[PDB]
Design a protein around this ligand. Structure first.
Ligand SMILES: CCCCCCCCCCCCCCCCCCCCCCCCCC(=O)N[C@@H](CO[C@H]1O[C@H](CO)[C@H](OCc2ccc(C(C)(C)C)cc2)[C@H](O)[C@H]1O)[C@H](O)[C@H](O)CCCCCCCCCCCCCC
Ligand SMILES: *[C@@H]1O[C@H](CO[C@@H]2O[C@@H](C)[C@@H](O)[C@@H](O)[C@@H]2O)[C@@H](O[C@@H]2O[C@H](CO)[C@@H](O)[C@H](O)[C@H]2NC(C)=O)[C@H](O)[C@H]1NC(C)=O
Ligand SMILES: *[C@@H]1O[C@H](CO)[C@@H](O[C@@H]2O[C@H](CO)[C@@H](O)[C@H](O)[C@H]2NC(C)=O)[C@H](O)[C@H]1NC(C)=O
Ligand SMILES: *[C@@H]1O[C@H](CO)[C@@H](O)[C@H](O)[C@H]1NC(C)=O
Ligand code: NA
Ligand code: NA
Ligand code: NA
Lengths: 98, 201, 271, 239
């Protein structure tokens, strides 16, 4: 049971107040059963789009979640993943500087 | 069911050809087998068809399969008495042991034997141990003749039955009557029996 | 050279419950999706039918529809057969398709993984286990290789159908396959166990090949670390390149980006 | 590739335990139990992929399967019911699709065994009138007074079974068709050439194998326990 990598990144250069798309890319996990949530200020964003699940050369799974978002000075954005390989859900926060 | 046979039953005269049908909805259809099952006996495989459009033969038996129409026919040429049996269609849904067999309910064929040289007669036969007991044997009538069940409750009459003396190429019909009461002259009165029936003594 | 990949993932949770989901890729573009919930294969491009007639596609799809149901039952029966050696839950993955080379040459493949390990392929005219596979698989292989009808169908699928279908896809899908999308870059920074870490973000480029270097003037900074290629939702790519530096050393540094879409006009961003 | 079944015929009572066995010396991994009922195709009850494996088929309820060895596959009716009156077929196979079928087992489950009775068997010798008229000789065998109708009638000449010139009624007839559990009668003919019948070295025997109670079955009536048995009648040829 391999443990999921989570990478969070914007489609476009982030500018406070400007609509954008936030991506959450979850990779290197198995088995494929997984729960992925994208959060605004720790609250579940509705209408998040998922790509179809696929797998790599090495047979490990991956999937892309994305959602419209407008970055601000105040608001926090994160991607939270529950998977049997982990005792607790893992949360990775969007950091525009990273 | 996923496998349907037609007709349900049929009666043919010896020497006639007949055709049996099998239609199925089984998917997929790896192969189709025809079995012959004699009364109280087991399954004798006649042919197996495997190709999309297939034809096979096995003596007087020939068969076709059309997997597009999901339809098979079994043809019997020049029927013999021994073709009297149930004929069963089976579809195998895999080319391996992972397959399930889907059985049709069968078609019952009866073949009426051709009696060339009839000689209708009623004989009395005596018991091997106690010669006071006897039966009446109505024999050597042609298949036109029908044997009717009994008038009296104390009188027993069997249905007709054809035997085949293979080495002499000879078949004959017979029926048997007996009673705890009764003579052979009167035994088959309830039956329309030929006028020239031999009653000896 | 393009690789066409049909990717099947099948979960069996117990004797009764299962699901099979498939995706199809031509290079890095998705051409089909086949959800467990759907009777039919879905096109994810206008050109996903390739150069197949409607009748040819309908016939091919029907074969796959029978396959999906048959596959599901066969796995369940093979579990019963090997019982109690193997128990649920079970994951089976298939990777099948062909790599297309110039001159009407191709190579086909059909690889099968069990619980995440490549154990079985189709090769020539039969199923075989590959090096490292457990011995118990010899019985399933024996059973699978008894099915002459499946062997003949798979031979035709790999040898004939795959390359013919894919050659058609390459013609029909040419303008998507050859699309050029321009990268857009931006800079940022963070601390890193000390030192600063400068980040050059590059997003929206297609196709994948890209060059990104931190630079002081004409001096390519050898400490530049390229991240992984990450997908955007619109079939473009995202990549970041980091550089560890000293606080106050940021002045002079630029990020240069070369990509086929820019036609020689590189992106240069000065910190 | 051969397959055998035992017993070949069984009369049982409701609530009793019945075991149908299938034996197979082909070293086949795979064995299968079916039942055949009029108006239906064979239906799969249980199957097995090897010693220790049993799997439910399409109609498993009321049956338990047992595969103690590669050779043997058993169908166990723990609490037999009349609905299990049927013909049962076992088959075996390897990784290939062919199933090799056994010869079948006939099972009748009665509500009660109180009426079970073996046949009387009588052999009737050919009429001299038939012999002079046809130069053929018909023997007739009569099995009477038996219940239920699970009998096999066969003809033996000099210790070897004969089939040529034989015909046996397709169904036993009821002796009291008004009564609920009528006893049955069955007749058979054997026709031979007059010279064959006239040869005093020819020993003729009609045999009826009757299926009834086992040793294990309880019997509370005064009359003899109507067990599975052979009853026969014989005669020698003569001038
Ligand atoms: C792959 C390249 C495709 C490129 C073109 C298409 C691209 C378009 C987009 C496609 C989107 C689809 C997404 C799916 C992607 C993954 C798919 C890759 C897997 C392909 C396998 C295809 C197998 C097809 C056949 C099949 O369904 N078999 C199935 C049905 O077979 C039955 O029906 C057939 C009807 O065609 C034939 O009967 C007809 C028949 C009979 C005789 C003959 C003769 C010519 C010999 C007389 C012919 C025909 C067969 O004989 C009959 O047995 C059969 O059940 C197979 O066993 C299914 C599973 C196969 C795969 C197994 C993988 C290995 C697993 C190892 C597991 C070990 C784990 C143990 C615990
Ligand atoms: C299909 O081609 C194979 C050989 O091609 C290889 O296996 C395919 C499944 C696919 O993965 C290709 O890209 C591979 O290069 C033929 O297999 C040969 O068949 C002959 C006789 O039939 C046999 O003697 C050879 O040893 C086989 N080759 C190998 C490597 O095993 C196969 O016959 C072709 N089938 C049809 C119907 O075209
Ligand atoms: C995945 O798809 C299969 C095939 O449609 C589903 O299996 C069917 O499920 C329905 C509803 O449960 C049953 O009535 C059918 O008998 C099943 N079809 C077959 C061909 O067996 C399966 O349930 C789906 N899996 C999930 C988890 O949704
Ligand atoms: C089988 O697995 C599913 C999904 O994990 C589960 O919800 C269900 O309870 C299981 N079904 C049975 C009959 O055990
Ligand atoms: Na006569
Ligand atoms: Na008993
Ligand atoms: Na049945």
């Amino acid at each position: 049971q391999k443990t999921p990598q989570i990478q969070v990144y914007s489609r476009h250069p982030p500018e406070n107040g400007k609509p954008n798309i936030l991506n959450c890319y979850v990779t290197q996990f198995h088995p494929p059963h997984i729960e992925i949530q994208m959060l605004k200020n720790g609250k579940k964003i509705p209408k998040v789009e998922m790509s179809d699940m696929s797998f790599s050369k090495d047979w490990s799974f991956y999937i892309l979640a994305h959602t419209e978002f407008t970055p601000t000075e105040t608001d926090t954005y994160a991607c939270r993943v529950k998977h049997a390989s982990m005792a607790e859900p893992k949360t990775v926060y969007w950091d525009r500087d990273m | 069911t996923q496998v349907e046979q037609s007709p349900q039953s049929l009666v043919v005269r010896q020497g006639e050809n007949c055709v049996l049908q099998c239609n199925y909805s089984v998917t997929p259809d790896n192969h189709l087998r025809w079995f012959k099952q004699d009364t109280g006996k087991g399954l004798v495989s006649l042919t197996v068809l495997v190709d999309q459009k297939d034809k096979t033969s096995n003596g007087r038996y020939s068969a076709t399969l059309d997997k597009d129409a999901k339809h098979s026919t079994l043809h019997i040429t020049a029927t013999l008495l021994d073709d009297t049996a149930t004929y069963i269609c089976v579809v195998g849904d895999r080319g391996s042991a992972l397959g399930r067999l889907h059985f049709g309910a069968g078609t019952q064929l009866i073949v009426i034997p051709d009696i060339q040289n009839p000689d209708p007669a009623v004989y009395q036969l005596r018991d091997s141990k106690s010669s006071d007991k006897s039966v009446c044997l109505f024999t050597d009538f042609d298949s036109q003749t029908n044997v009717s069940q009994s008038k009296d409750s104390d009188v027993y009459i069997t249905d007709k039955c054809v035997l085949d003396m293979r080495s002499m190429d000879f078949k004959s019909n017979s029926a048997v009557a007996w009673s705890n009461k009764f003579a052979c002259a009167n035994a088959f009165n309830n039956s329309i029996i030929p006028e020239d029936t031999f009653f000896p003594s | 050279n393009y690789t066409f990949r049909c990717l099947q993932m099948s979960s069996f949770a117990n004797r009764s419950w299962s699901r099979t989901d498939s995706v199809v890729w031509l290079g890095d573009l998705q051409t089909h999706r086949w959800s467990n919930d759907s009777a039919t294969i879905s096109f994810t491009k206008p050109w996903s039918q390739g150069k197949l007639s409607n009748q040819q596609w309908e016939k091919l799809q029907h074969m796959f529809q029978v396959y999906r149901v048959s596959f599901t039952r066969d796995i369940q029966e093979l579990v019963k057969m090997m019982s109690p050696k193997e128990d649920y839950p079970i994951e089976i993955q298939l990777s099948a398709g062909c790599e297309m080379y110039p001159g009407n040459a191709s190579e086909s493949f059909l690889h099968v993984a069990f619980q995440g390990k490549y154990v079985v392929r189709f090769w020539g005219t039969s199923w075989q286990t590959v090096p490292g596979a457990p011995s118990w698989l010899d019985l399933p292989i024996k059973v699978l290789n008894a099915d002459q009808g499946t062997s003949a169908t798979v031979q035709m699928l790999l040898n004939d159908t795959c390359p013919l279908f894919v050659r058609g896809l390459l013609e029909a899908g040419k303008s998507d396959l050859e699309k050029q999308e321009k990268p857009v870059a931006w800079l940022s920074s963070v601390p890193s166990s000390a030192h600063r870490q400068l980040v050059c973000h590059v997003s929206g480029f297609y196709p994948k090949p890209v060059w990104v270097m931190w630079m002081r003037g004409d001096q390519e900074q050898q400490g530049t670390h390229r991240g992984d290629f990450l997908p955007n939702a619109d079939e473009t790519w995202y990549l970041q390149a980091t550089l560890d530096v000293e606080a106050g050393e940021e002045a002079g540094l630029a990020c240069r980006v070369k990509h086929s879409s820019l036609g020689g006009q590189d992106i240069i961003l000065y910190w | 590739a051969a397959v055998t079944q035992s017993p070949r015929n069984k009369v049982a009572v409701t609530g009793g335990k019945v075991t149908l066995s299938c034996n197979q010396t082909n070293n086949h991994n795979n064995m299968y139990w079916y039942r055949q009922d009029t108006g239906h195709g064979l239906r799969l009850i249980h199957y097995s992929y090897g010693a220790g494996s049993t799997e439910k088929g399409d109609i498993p309820d009321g049956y338990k399967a047992s595969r103690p060895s590669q050779e043997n596959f058993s169908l166990i009716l723990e609490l037999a019911t009349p609905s299990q009156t049927s013909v049962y077929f076992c088959a075996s196979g390897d990784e290939g699709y062919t199933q090799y079928f056994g010869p079948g087992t006939r099972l009748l489950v009665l509500e009660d065994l109180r009426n079970v009775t073996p046949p009387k068997v009588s052999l009737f010798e050919p009429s001299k009138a038939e012999i002079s008229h046809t130069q053929k000789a018909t023997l007739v065998c009569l099995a009477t007074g038996f219940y239920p109708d699970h009998v096999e009638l066969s003809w033996w000449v000099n210790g070897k079974e004969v089939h040529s010139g034989v015909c046996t009624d397709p169904q036993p007839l009821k002796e009291q068709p008004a009564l609920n559990d009528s006893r049955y009668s069955l007749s058979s003919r054997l026709r031979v050439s007059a010279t064959f019948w006239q040869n005093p070295r020819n020993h003729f025997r009609c045999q009826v194998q009757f299926y009834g109670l086992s040793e294990n079955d309880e019997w509370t009536q005064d009359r003899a326990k109507p067990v599975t048995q052979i009853v026969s009648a014989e005669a020698w040829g003569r001038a």
